[PDB]
């Protein structure tokens with residue numbers, strides 16, 4: 001039914017002409033449109049599947065963006081601006097400023113290669129500033145991932161970089177914004193037991209110990225390592241394998257978190273019940289590595305990045321670095337006068 005109303009040429013709300021699809025999910029899709037009542041300006045419209053789960057998420061997102069766009073009308077803190085919302089043939093549609101590619105599509109279309117370190121630095125700072133602003137307003141985003149970070153403009157120059165032997169796309173401007181506030185939760189709201197997309201899920205979430213702001217910090221840690229590597233660090237759908245991956249990369253989970261989890265399935269007597277010599281086990285041993293072994297250079301800037309990531313990927317949420325502390329980290333010094 002959604003395909004009936006989201007095609008090129010369609011006009012929504014007697015105003016917005018659909019050009020093309022920007023992205024799709026189980027929530028619905030986002031299409032680029034020409035706004036004929038605003039001079040031809042292109043915008044992005046999110047058309048939400050007509051399903052209670054996703055409908056409530058959209059009403060929720062509207063609430064949250066009205067708050068944030070009011071607090072921060074100039075978008076100093078880099079949340080996407082919502083321009084309008086409306087109903088179209090029973091579907092909630094939310095209009096946003098049009099942005100560039102997500103950091104995920106860019107990596108994908110560039111052959112799954114990493115970003116340059118100086119871009120990672122600017123991007124990381126903006127992500128941390130943005131989400132920290134959410135945290136100031138008693139909000140957790142809960143679904144941070146590279147699909148939900150978008151370049152403001154994804155214009156690029158090309159050069160034959162013979163370090164790979166292939167034409168290369170290089171970002172002109174690495175500014176980003178954060179999108180997708182339909183899972184965002186206030187400190188006082190009910191916290192659902194399963195949040196975040198699998199690969200960016202914090203261990204307190206997987207183990208169902210409760211969560212709040214710190215789980216975003218774990219997500220940002222994952223995002224940063226993917227920017228550095230150009231691939232997903234926890235490419236698994238299974239929770240136990242995910243936990244095994246964490247151990248191979250970050251070492252054993254804290255005894256005290258294991259004792260507390262309602263998810264007894266995953267464990268035996270204080271250790272993860274994981275057979276290293278199994279098929280999946282041997283894959284994890286050879287693929288996954290201790291964090292620091294992923295570094296591509298001993299150069300101090302690389303070390304600095306990896307120190308920050310390590311602190312974002314602290315298992316115990318109570319000990320995990322906060323974004324307020326993260327913004328003062330030495331990795332970011334190169335962005336400041338002195």
Ligand SMILES: Nc1ncc2cc3cnccc3c(N)c2n1
Nearest residue numbers: 030044096097098099100179180
């Ligand atoms: N290019 C572009 N521009 C704005 C967007 C807003 C969005 C707002 N919420 C979710 C997804 C969204 C997108 N994929 C967007 N894509």
